Design an enzyme around this catalytic site. Structure first.
Site, PDB file in Angstrom:
ATOM      1  N   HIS A  87       0.829  -1.237   0.000  1.00  0.00           N
ATOM      2  CA  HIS A  87       0.000   0.000   0.000  1.00  0.00           C
ATOM      3  C   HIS A  87       0.853   1.273   0.000  1.00  0.00           C
ATOM      4  O   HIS A  87       0.266   2.350  -0.041  1.00  0.00           O
ATOM      5  CB  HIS A  87      -1.064  -0.046   1.101  1.00  0.00           C
ATOM      6  CG  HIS A  87      -0.551   0.110   2.486  1.00  0.00           C
ATOM      7  ND1 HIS A  87      -0.399  -0.961   3.329  1.00  0.00           N
ATOM      8  CD2 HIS A  87      -0.243   1.201   3.210  1.00  0.00           C
ATOM      9  CE1 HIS A  87       0.019  -0.540   4.506  1.00  0.00           C
ATOM     10  NE2 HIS A  87       0.143   0.773   4.453  1.00  0.00           N
TER      11      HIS A  87
ATOM     12  N   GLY B  80       2.344   6.144  10.060  1.00  0.00           N
ATOM     13  CA  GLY B  80       3.696   6.077   9.489  1.00  0.00           C
ATOM     14  C   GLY B  80       4.506   4.900  10.003  1.00  0.00           C
ATOM     15  O   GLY B  80       5.649   4.750   9.530  1.00  0.00           O
TER      16      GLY B  80
ATOM     17  N   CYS C 293       3.739   1.726   9.451  1.00  0.00           N
ATOM     18  CA  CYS C 293       3.640   0.603   8.503  1.00  0.00           C
ATOM     19  C   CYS C 293       5.035   0.304   7.946  1.00  0.00           C
ATOM     20  O   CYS C 293       5.782   1.239   7.594  1.00  0.00           O
ATOM     21  CB  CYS C 293       2.597   0.812   7.408  1.00  0.00           C
ATOM     22  SG  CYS C 293       2.488   2.498   6.770  1.00  0.00           S
TER      23      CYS C 293
HETATM   24  C1  R8H Z   1       0.761   2.989   7.164  1.00  0.00           C
HETATM   25  O1  R8H Z   1      -0.168   2.141   6.550  1.00  0.00           O
HETATM   26  C2  R8H Z   1       0.590   2.884   8.660  1.00  0.00           C
HETATM   27  O2  R8H Z   1       1.267   3.596   9.391  1.00  0.00           O
HETATM   28  N1  R8H Z   1      -0.216   1.936   9.136  1.00  0.00           N
HETATM   29  C3  R8H Z   1      -0.056   1.377  10.470  1.00  0.00           C
HETATM   30  C4  R8H Z   1      -0.730   2.162  11.566  1.00  0.00           C
HETATM   31  C5  R8H Z   1      -1.385   3.355  11.339  1.00  0.00           C
HETATM   32  C6  R8H Z   1      -1.937   4.025  12.413  1.00  0.00           C
HETATM   33  C7  R8H Z   1      -1.855   3.478  13.663  1.00  0.00           C
HETATM   34  C8  R8H Z   1      -1.187   2.295  13.814  1.00  0.00           C
HETATM   35  N2  R8H Z   1      -0.647   1.623  12.787  1.00  0.00           N
HETATM   36  C9  R8H Z   1       0.438   4.363   6.632  1.00  0.00           C
HETATM   37  C10 R8H Z   1       0.907   4.657   5.203  1.00  0.00           C
HETATM   38  C11 R8H Z   1       0.781   6.100   4.767  1.00  0.00           C
HETATM   39  C12 R8H Z   1      -0.325   6.538   4.054  1.00  0.00           C
HETATM   40  C13 R8H Z   1      -0.414   7.856   3.629  1.00  0.00           C
HETATM   41  C14 R8H Z   1       0.605   8.741   3.900  1.00  0.00           C
HETATM   42  C15 R8H Z   1       1.713   8.317   4.587  1.00  0.00           C
HETATM   43  C16 R8H Z   1       1.803   7.003   5.020  1.00  0.00           C
HETATM   44  N3  R8H Z   1      -0.881   4.922   6.883  1.00  0.00           N
HETATM   45  C17 R8H Z   1      -1.193   5.847   7.791  1.00  0.00           C
HETATM   46  O3  R8H Z   1      -0.359   6.384   8.514  1.00  0.00           O
HETATM   47  C18 R8H Z   1      -2.681   6.106   7.929  1.00  0.00           C
HETATM   48  C19 R8H Z   1      -3.359   5.294   9.016  1.00  0.00           C
HETATM   49  C20 R8H Z   1      -4.493   6.189   9.506  1.00  0.00           C
HETATM   50  C21 R8H Z   1      -4.300   7.520   8.820  1.00  0.00           C
HETATM   51  O4  R8H Z   1      -4.951   8.540   9.032  1.00  0.00           O
HETATM   52  N4  R8H Z   1      -3.317   7.395   7.902  1.00  0.00           N
HETATM   53  C22 R8H Z   1      -2.991   8.418   6.916  1.00  0.00           C
HETATM   54  C23 R8H Z   1      -2.124   9.523   7.460  1.00  0.00           C
HETATM   55  C24 R8H Z   1      -0.797   9.637   7.076  1.00  0.00           C
HETATM   56  C25 R8H Z   1      -0.008  10.664   7.576  1.00  0.00           C
HETATM   57  C26 R8H Z   1      -0.536  11.573   8.461  1.00  0.00           C
HETATM   58  C27 R8H Z   1      -1.851  11.473   8.843  1.00  0.00           C
HETATM   59  C28 R8H Z   1      -2.645  10.451   8.347  1.00  0.00           C
END
Ligand code: R8H
Ligand code: R8H
EC number: 3.4.19.12
Lengths: 305, 305
Positions: free
Chosen positions: B41, B143, B145
């Site tokens: 993803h 972040g 992931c």
């Molecule tokens: C990645 O999938 C992730 O960190 N998932 C594991 C996780 C997330 C939250 C809590 C615990 N574990 C990640 C990938 C990504 C997507 C878009 C931009 C940057 C990175 N996804 C996220 O961090 C997700 C999860 C919930 C959310 O709001 N979000 C998007 C995001 C990204 C950056 C800042 C705010 C929100």
């Protein structure tokens, strides 16, 4: 989401661990630049530990009596000196893996990571706190002496603990990296009793803020209190007194959650008086006191190194 | 003495963490030899995650669309492929810090260390377990992931987990390093409910042995039981059934303590029926189930890496 007892990444410290041997005694040392730091009782036999005179025992030792092994290669010892309860062994090679570092002496209530080592090799990493009675509740076996405790600020390792002794009650005593014991403890095999192990109130409050941030909110009550009122209850339950300095350190967590510090004190007061009633907070059935306010902010904000 | 939730030393894994960016999405990757592994993803926008077709999204991507940064230096991507729910990015440089490693798929009840990372930089290390419902109770933020879970056997890192998703209940889901999810979870922003989070009985028994080794013995009772009798109680309390395979794995701890496994089962049965009565075991007010029998032997024997 979630909240874990989280240690600092240990790599920067793993690169500093060595084995030190003097006669038949082997323990761990910390190699930083061209100095190896280790407990001074490396010079003692088990028999010597009953009543050692360290200055007298050190007269019988030369540089070549200290064997230092780093990843199965021998280091040449070109000087030695005793500083309080540690030995400093000058070696002819600077550790190429030396991180940016400082030596700090921590206050009771401050947390740190321990890299438990045996024969100069890492076994595991876990999170501890300096207890109010200047013991630590570690996990250490025979040969763990010279294992260190540390914090990291981005790229800088602050070494705060070197492990020396296990007390008869199975709690742990040691020094800062200047060789000064935390608390009244001495490097002698004599019965040494710890004082009251009181609960670190500011850390409990930090962890209740962590609980709220994570959506564990059942314990939030309808009450506030004052520092003086709260502290009458703290004293009854063997909690450390809360100071305005503690209230100030909790400000960021108060701001994030919108819960006034004295409101959270009132919720803690009711938990102490009422108990948990078989409920849990962040998966614990007791109030956790080995997260500092800074630890909670770090874990809840994802600070990296 | 003492008993702590202890992680493996993280240095060997710290040396493998990188940042992967595709368009505006940044997450963590694992760099081993000339391959970087990351969640597939990375190719999705937040909008895409509501209902992604990964094969279709990957048609719009070339090698140069994947930005890999290792300690603030860019790696050249010379191939990419999708394996289940991970991407494998072939880079032109073998990681010089690659440890001996294996990819393993673990069973429910097995523990591992997590190196929580953000932007390819380590935040912290903690100990987890694969829950019986194939979730993990991690500590992860946006972040995280691409963060990994692992065990070490002396010098060999067995990677068992890569973090992908947070479920609406704040528990965590992810894959093995072949990209296969643990449990029924999918890499889509859709409501996904976890099954019953049952207690890992063999791990609780291991931890009661740890308690006895450490001198916490108040809970030892006058009774024995049978597997069938014990399992009637286990089912009532949402404990996993105990098998003869579990009894066999507990043999070394039985031998060390002289307490027959079924005697320890009878002591656990009484704790489930009677509760703790406000008492603690190894500083816990609840029965701990995230130490395996091997973890207890390792911590109580001082095994190093
Ligand atoms: C990645 O999938 C992730 O960190 N998932 C594991 C996780 C997330 C939250 C809590 C615990 N574990 C990640 C990938 C990504 C997507 C878009 C931009 C940057 C990175 N996804 C996220 O961090 C997700 C999860 C919930 C959310 O709001 N979000 C998007 C995001 C990204 C950056 C800042 C705010 C929100
Ligand atoms: C060292 O002082 C040490 O490990 N202390 C910390 C500790 C000890 C036990 C539990 C928790 N924490 C260490 C130095 C040493 C001395 C002689 C030989 C080798 C190393 N001392 C010991 O390991 C002590 C402590 C109790 C004990 O019986 N013992 C001596 C010993 C050494 C090796 C095998 C068995 C016993």
């Amino acid at each position: 989401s979630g909240f874990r007892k989280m240690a600092f990444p240990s790599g920067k410290v793993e690169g500093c661990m060595v084995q030190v041997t003097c006669g038949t005694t082997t323990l761990n040392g910390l190699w930083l630049d061209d100095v190896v730091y280790c407990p001074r009782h490396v010079i003692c036999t088990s028999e010597d530990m009953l009543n050692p005179n360290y200055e007298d025992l050190l007269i019988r030792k030369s540089n070549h009596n200290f064997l230092v092994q780093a990843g199965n290669v021998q280091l040449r010892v070109i000087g030695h000196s005793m500083q309080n309860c540690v030995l400093k062994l000058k070696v002819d090679t600077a550790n190429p893996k030396t991180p940016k570092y400082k030596f700090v002496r921590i206050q009771p209530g401050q947390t740190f990571s321990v890299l438990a080592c045996y024969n100069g090799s890492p076994s595991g990493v876990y999170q501890c706190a300096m207890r109010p009675n200047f013991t630590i509740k570690g996990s250490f076996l025979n040969g763990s002496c010279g294992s260190v405790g540390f914090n990291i600020d981005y790229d800088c390792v602050s070494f705060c603990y070197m492990h020396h002794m296990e007390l008869p009650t199975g709690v742990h005593a040691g020094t800062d990296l200047e060789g000064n014991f935390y608390g009244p403890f001495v490097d002698r095999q004599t019965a040494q009793a710890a004082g009251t192990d009181t609960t670190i109130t500011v850390n409990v409050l930090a962890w209740l803020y962590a609980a709220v941030i994570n959506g564990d909110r059942w314990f939030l009550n309808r009450f506030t209190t004052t520092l003086n009122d709260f502290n009458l209850v703290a004293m009854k339950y063997n909690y450390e007194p809360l100071t305005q300095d503690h209230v100030d350190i909790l400000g960021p967590l108060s701001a994030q959650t919108g819960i006034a510090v004295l409101d959270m004190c009132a919720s803690l007061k009711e938990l102490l008086q009422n108990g948990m009633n078989g409920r849990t907070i962040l998966g614990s059935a007791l109030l956790e006191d080995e997260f500092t306010p800074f630890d909670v902010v770090r874990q809840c904000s994802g600070v990296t190194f």
